Amino acid sequence: CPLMVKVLDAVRGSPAINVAVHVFRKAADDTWEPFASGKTSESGELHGLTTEEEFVEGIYKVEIDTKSYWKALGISPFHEHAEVVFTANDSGPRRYTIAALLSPYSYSTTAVVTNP
Amino acid sequence: CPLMVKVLDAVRGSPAINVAVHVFRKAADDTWEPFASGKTSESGELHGLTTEEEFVEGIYKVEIDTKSYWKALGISPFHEHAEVVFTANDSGPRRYTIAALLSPYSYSTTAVVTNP
Amino acid sequence: CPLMVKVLDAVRGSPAINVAVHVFRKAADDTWEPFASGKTSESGELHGLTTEEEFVEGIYKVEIDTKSYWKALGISPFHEHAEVVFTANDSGPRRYTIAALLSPYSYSTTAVVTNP
Amino acid sequence: CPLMVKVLDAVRGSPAINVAVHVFRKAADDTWEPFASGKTSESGELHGLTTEEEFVEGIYKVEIDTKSYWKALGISPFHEHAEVVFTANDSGPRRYTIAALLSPYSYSTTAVVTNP
Ligand SMILES: O=C(O)c1ccccc1Nc1cc(Cl)cc(Cl)c1
Ligand SMILES: O=C(O)c1ccccc1Nc1cc(Cl)cc(Cl)c1
């Protein structure tokens, strides 16, 4: 689909499974509106968040609930969640992958944006 | 001081200088309230955000305006900003350093928390 | 296969395509011996490096030729290559993914190790 | 001095203290020669590796013994060490900082290169 999220675990060397991911879109009135959400699969990936028809240009926030993930693994972590804010631009046909690599006191995120 | 932010640039191999950093605290009514802010120095570090008296337990967000930083370097980047949300807990005397390593489509952040 | 490498580009937000990857194994005499090698595909992934029969316990080094990759993109980077050294242990059936996220002056690497 | 190394711990949110760091230089015969080495201080930093007189252009490898560091903290990690290979070039007066952020299955490294 146009938007995928993948989450990896740097402490156990594994995909981060069953992580809640929320996508919000900035609405015309400058509030965050719920856009899509889901939980990562056993490969750490979350597919099927949205469709080409629903995913329009705008400012999006991807919120990953890293706190609940770590607690389910027996870890009480530093961050409340990991979040990523970015603009989706139509200049071409695009697909976005937001990936995050998690540790208890750190995270990395990157975006892969490709043209089909 | 109890809270320091440092920002590095992975494209030029340099501290990220003159980056705007905003700290917000969650208020009793669950909105973000401006708490402190500043701009990184030539070493990439932002000192003097707050004092021991002002920095209480709570939920804080550190927002780094990476978009303006990249544009001043001639780069139009992916993220709108980089932000870090975490709980400050009194269990002991603590000092927090929030560091971020920036690229145009990615960033890393980590926290260093030490007891003086 | 038991060993996969994936390489991402943090400057362009894209898989790192056609990157040379060399795998070495430490031999009984403590030299590095060429074990397997290949180039990443259009998805940034390198499959088919080795087989279950050939991939034994040992100490492996994965060397990614990031210098040639950046130069082909018009960038003269800091590192000569990115390399990752680790032990493969038989304690169970295992599959290893070595991933790397590249910038001109920085890189991240992580390992995903799963049991089929 | 012209070359500094700093090491941070993403699992405990702390500088990585007492970590052994080895610097090697490629000699005329294409072997690695020991150049300098030391152990990180309580701030995670290793100062005083070398002098302006000794630090010449060349190809250097910085090897961080992350395995012993994790084991002293009670963790049996994935990597044998973290290493960083790069060219030092005289085009100007330069100072190099090699920083590494460590987790049990991942690490990040970046370089900060500045002109005094
Ligand atoms: O992108 C992937 O599909 C992938 C798969 C396995 C491991 C890592 C992956 N990316 C990755 C994402 C971040 Cl944020 C950092 C790093 Cl070192 C790799
Ligand atoms: O923390 C420091 O003081 C520092 C100084 C120079 C370079 C890097 C530093 N940290 C660092 C921070 C992140 Cl987020 C990632 C990485 Cl590899 C290093």
Long-range contacts of C30-39, Cβ-Cβ distance < 8 Å, separation of 24 or more? C32/C61, C35/C60, C36/C3
DSSP string, A71-95: HHTT---SEEEEEEEEEE--SSS-E
A66 touches A19 (CB < 8 A): yes
C35 touches C50 (CB < 8 A): yes
Ranges of H-type helices in chain D: 66-72
Q: Domains of chain D: which residue ranges?
A: 3-114
Question: What is the Cα–Cα distance from A74 to D104, expressed in whole angstroms?
Answer: 16
The token pair at D16 is 């990585």
The token pair at D62 is 């910085």
Q: How was this structure determined?
A: X-ray
Q: How far is B67 from chain C (nearest CA, A)?
A: 14
The set of residues, in sequence order, having a beta carbon less than 8 Å from that of C74 and lying 6+ positions away, is none
How remote is the CA of residue C28 from the centroid of ligand 1, in Å? 32
User: What is the tally of helices (H) and strands (E) in chain D?
Assistant: 1, 9
Q: How far is A17 from chain D (nearest CA, A)?
A: 17
SS3 for B68?
helix
The number of beta carbons lying within 10 Å of the beta carbon of residue A72 is 11
The token pair at C89 is 């242990």
B105 touches B89 (CB < 8 A): no
Question: What is the Cα–Cα distance from B104 to B81, expressed in whole angstroms?
Answer: 11
The number of beta carbons lying within 10 Å of the beta carbon of residue D27 is 12
Candidate from D78, D103, D108 with C-beta closest to C86: D78
Give Rg (Cα) of chain B: 14
Q: Which ligand is nearest to the CA of B102?
A: 2
Question: What is the Cα–Cα distance from D100 to D9, expressed in whole angstroms?
Answer: 9
The number of beta carbons lying within 10 Å of the beta carbon of residue C41 is 15
B43-79 burial string, b = 16+ CB within 10 Å, else e? Answer: ebebeebbeeeebeebebbbbbbbbebbeeeebebbb
Strand pairing class (D79-88; A32-39) = unpaired
The set of residues, in sequence order, having a beta carbon less than 8 Å from that of A22 and lying 6+ positions away, is A34, A36, A37, A62, A63, A65
Question: What is the Cα–Cα distance from D43 to D6, expressed in whole angstroms?
Answer: 8
Question: What angle is formed at CA C28 by the lines to CA C27 and CA C32, rounded to 5 degrees?
Answer: 25
The answer to whether the Cβ–Cβ distance between D11 and A11 falls below 8 Å is yes
Q: What is the CATH number of domain C3-114?
A: 2.60.40.180
Q: What letter does residue C38 receive in the DSSP assignment?
A: E
How remote is the CA of residue A46 from the centroid of ligand 1, in Å? 14
Which has the closest alpha carbon to A73: A4, A5, A7?
A: A7
